[PDB]
Scaffold this active site. Structure first.
Site, short mmCIF file in Angstrom:
data_model
loop_
_atom_site.label_atom_id
_atom_site.label_comp_id
_atom_site.label_asym_id
_atom_site.label_seq_id
_atom_site.Cartn_x
_atom_site.Cartn_y
_atom_site.Cartn_z
N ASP A 142 0.82 -1.22 0.00
CA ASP A 142 0.00 0.00 0.00
C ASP A 142 0.86 1.28 0.00
O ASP A 142 0.64 2.20 0.79
CB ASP A 142 -0.97 -0.04 1.20
CG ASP A 142 -2.07 1.02 1.13
OD1 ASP A 142 -2.32 1.63 0.06
OD2 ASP A 142 -2.70 1.24 2.18
N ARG A 146 -0.63 9.25 0.89
CA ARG A 146 -1.41 9.29 2.16
C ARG A 146 -0.77 8.46 3.29
O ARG A 146 -1.04 8.67 4.47
CB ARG A 146 -2.85 8.82 1.92
CG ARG A 146 -2.93 7.35 1.49
CD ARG A 146 -4.34 6.81 1.19
NE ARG A 146 -4.19 5.45 0.67
CZ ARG A 146 -4.08 5.13 -0.62
NH1 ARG A 146 -4.18 6.07 -1.55
NH2 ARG A 146 -3.90 3.88 -0.98
#
Ligand SMILES: O=S(=O)(O)CCS
Ligand SMILES: O=S(=O)(O)CCS
Length: 291
Positions: A142, A146
């Protein structure tokens, strides 16, 4: 519940328990994250809401185990835990620059002192983090703006990988997710079609992170939905260069986005190429676009 990293197994008991009375919450940062204080140590405090299940709780404990085992300057430090009181805390390195996406959006010229070399240093920081993970056979799954954080807003900022939620889900078979929650715009074809993950799938996600950095915090494939991206990418479609992006930097992106994992560079090669970029005056003298 056990976890192995770098050839060493650990359990909950290996975590450094900080007495609850030693911990003060100062402000909400946006479970929840707080700026806190151990006494004096300035810390971030991630909390587990008490209204979560026993499974969510073990998930939270695994996250703590994972982060505590890393030893690298470009991965957020785990200061310790507070698990013998409710709500459970995880204590982390305070990252005063906040997340990378927000930072990019907030500090983009509209004029600012952010320059091409600053963006390349951020990319280098995260690639260094990623190389450490790869060398230690850990797949992040991931990589995205962010999930990266900055030590401070100013000139001496260091970027670090600061979320390991998705990697954790796999160590616990978390199901509790679903299609609409998968970070599709950051994933290579073998990941979204086959559920295949390797260090070369992090290479793909890193190229999309690069696009995020050099576009100054735009959403990847800005005018497309997740499914449109899936169809676009499987058909050989790739993002255009961000506005004003030098060619040598875009070229790293397109190499990260090669259809077959074996054709994508590893993180050592990515690092070599980022460095070449910081050495090219025509790259680093390029002006950032104004909002
Ligand atoms: O999914 S989470 O563990 O972050 C929230 C459960 S209350
Ligand atoms: O070469 S650097 O020290 O900038 C990064 C090491 S991963």
């Amino acid at each position: 519940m056990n976890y192995c990293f770098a050839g060493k197994t650990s359990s909950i008991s290996d975590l450094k328990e900080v007495p609850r009375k030693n911990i003060t919450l100062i402000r909400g940062l946006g479970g929840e994250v707080y700026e806190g204080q151990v006494s004096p140590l300035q810390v971030a405090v991630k909390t587990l809401p008490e209204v979560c299940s026993e499974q969510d709780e073990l998930d939270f404990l695994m996250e703590a185990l994972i982060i505590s085992k890393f030893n690298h300057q470009n991965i957020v430090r785990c200061i310790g835990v507070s698990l013998q009181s409710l709500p459970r805390f995880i204590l982390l390195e305070l990252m005063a620059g906040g997340d990378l996406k927000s930072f990019l959006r907030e500090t983009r010229p509209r004029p600012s002192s952010l320059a091409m070399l600053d963006l390349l240093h951020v990319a280098r920081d995260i690639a260094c983090g990623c190389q450490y993970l790869e060398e230690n056979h850990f797949i992040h799954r991931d990589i995205a703006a962010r999930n990266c954080l900055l030590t401070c807003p100013g000139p001496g900022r260091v970027a670090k990988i600061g979320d390991f939620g998705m990697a954790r889900d796999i160590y616990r078979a978390s199901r509790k997710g679903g299609c609409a929650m998968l970070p599709v715009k950051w994933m290579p074809p073998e990941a979204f079609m086959e559920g295949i993950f390797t260090s070369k799938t992090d290479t793909w996600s890193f190229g999309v992170l690069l696009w995020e950095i050099f576009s100054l915090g735009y959403m990847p494939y800005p005018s497309k939905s997740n499914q449109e991206v899936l169809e676009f990418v499987t058909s050989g479609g790739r993002m255009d260069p961000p506005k004003n992006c030098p060619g040598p930097v875009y070229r790293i992106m397109t190499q990260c986005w090669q259809h077959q994992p074996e054709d994508r560079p590893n993180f050592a090669i990515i690092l070599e190429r980022i460095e070449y970029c910081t050495q090219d005056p025509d790259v680093i003298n390029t002006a950032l676009p104004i909002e």
